[PDB]
C-alpha cells in the first residue's frame, strides 16, 4: 500500500503511552535506574489514575499552544527508495487481500460442526491460535466463518481462540507493483523541566521496544532503527527554556499498488488447417 509512518506512530504511541501512564509499577520498573527523587517526582506528577498533570502527543506546526510541561512532538522526516524488484513485481495474487487482522472468537456447535465466526470475510487464514488440525478434522473456511468437525472434538464445544487472518476485497487477479522505501520520523519529548525530558526519553524508548512486536510493524514498517540526539534547549527566550532530546525512528517499508489484470483465459482450442501450396 501507500503508507504514512507519521500517522502510524501517532496512532500507536498515544494508546500505549496512556496505558503505561495509568499503570504505576510499569513506570516504577522503567525508571529504576534514575535518581530516587526524579523517579518519585515523575511518578507522583504524571503517573497513575489520579495524575493531575498529563502528557500529550501530536504533530508539529499546530496553530495553538501546547502542553509544554510534557509533550511528544512527532515530525515526519526524510526517506529514499532502497531496493527494487525485477519488473517492480513486489508480489502477485489470485484474490485481492486486505489488511492482516487478529480477532478473539469462541467456538459454537452448528449441525455437528464446530464453527468460529469472524467479523469480516476471510481472504486467508494464517493461524487459529493453539490448534493444528488433522485432515480428519475436515477444516474448511467459507465466507466469514471457519468450520471444524464436531465428532471427535465435543470437549471443545465452547473453546475460546484468537484467529489471525486477512480480509479479502474482491475476487480478482493482479500484480502488486511497487518498491521498498527507508524513511525517518523524528520524535522529541518537550519539557521545561530537564528531568521530565529525560524521563520522557526513557518512556519513549520503552514504548518503541514494546512496539517492535506489534503486527503493524512486523508485517510492514520493518527494521526499526533508533538514533538519539543531544539534550538541548528547543526554545531559549521565554521566561524559561524548553528542553528536549530528539530521537529518530527509521523504518523500511513497501510502497505499492494493486495493478488488477482483467484478462483471463479459460479455454485453449486447437484447429488443423491444410496447406495445399
Amino acid at each position: 500500500a501507500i503508507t504514512s509512518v507519521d500517522s502510524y506512530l501517532l496512532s500507536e504511541i498515544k494508546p500505549r503511552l496512556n496505558t503505561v501512564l495509568e499503570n504505576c509499577y510499569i513506570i516504577d520498573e522503567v525508571l529504576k535506574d534514575f535518581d530516587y527523587q526524579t523517579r518519585e517526582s515523575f511518578k507522583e506528577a504524571f503517573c497513575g489514575k489520579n495524575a493531575q498533570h498529563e502528557v500529550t502527543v501530536g504533530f508539529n506546526f499546530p496553530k495553538f499552544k501546547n502542553n509544554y510541561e510534557a509533550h511528544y512532538l512527532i515530525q515526519l522526516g526524510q526517506g529514499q527508495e532502497t531496493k527494487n524488484s525485477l519488473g517492480s513485481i513486489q508480489s502477485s495474487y489470485f484474490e485481492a487481500t486486505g489488511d492482516t487482522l487478529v480477532e478473539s472468537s469462541t467456538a459454537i456447535r452448528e449441525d455437528d460442526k464446530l464453527v468460529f465466526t469472524v467479523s469480516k470475510p476471510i481472504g486467508e487464514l494464517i493461524k487459529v491460535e493453539d490448534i493444528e488440525f488433522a485432515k480428519y478434522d475436515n477444516l474448511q473456511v467459507e465466507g466469514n466463518k471457519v468450520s471444524f468437525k464436531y465428532q471427535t472434538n465435543e470437549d471443545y464445544e465452547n473453546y475460546n481462540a484468537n484467529i489471525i487472518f486477512t480480509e479479502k476485497k474482491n475476487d480478482s487477479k493482479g500484480l502488486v507493483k511497487g518498491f521498498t522505501v527507508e524513511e525517518q520520523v523524528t520524535v522529541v519529548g518537550l519539557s521545561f523541566n530537564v528531568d521530565v525530558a529525560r524521563c520522557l526519553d526513557a518512556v519513549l524508548k520503552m514504548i518503541l521496544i514494546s512496539m517492535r512486536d506489534s503486527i503493524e510493524e512486523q508485517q510492514t514498517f520493518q527494521l526499526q532503527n533508533l538514533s538519539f540526539g543531544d539534550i538541548a534547549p528547543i526554545i531559549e527566550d521565554g521566561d524559561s527554556m524548553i528542553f528536549g532530546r530528539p530521537t529518530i525512528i527509521k523504518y523500511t517499508s513497501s510502497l505499492d499498488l494493486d495493478y488488477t489484470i482483467t484478462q483471463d483465459i479459460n479455454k485453449l482450442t486447437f484447429k488443423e488447417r491444410k496447406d495445399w501450396k
Binding site: 499546530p62 496553530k63 495553538f64 499552544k65 512532538l73
Partner: peptide
C-alpha cells in the same frame, strides 16, 4: 509562531 506552537516572549 513555532513548530511547537505559539508562544509569547
Amino acid at each position: 509562531q513555532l513548530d511547537i506552537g505559539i508562544l509569547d516572549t
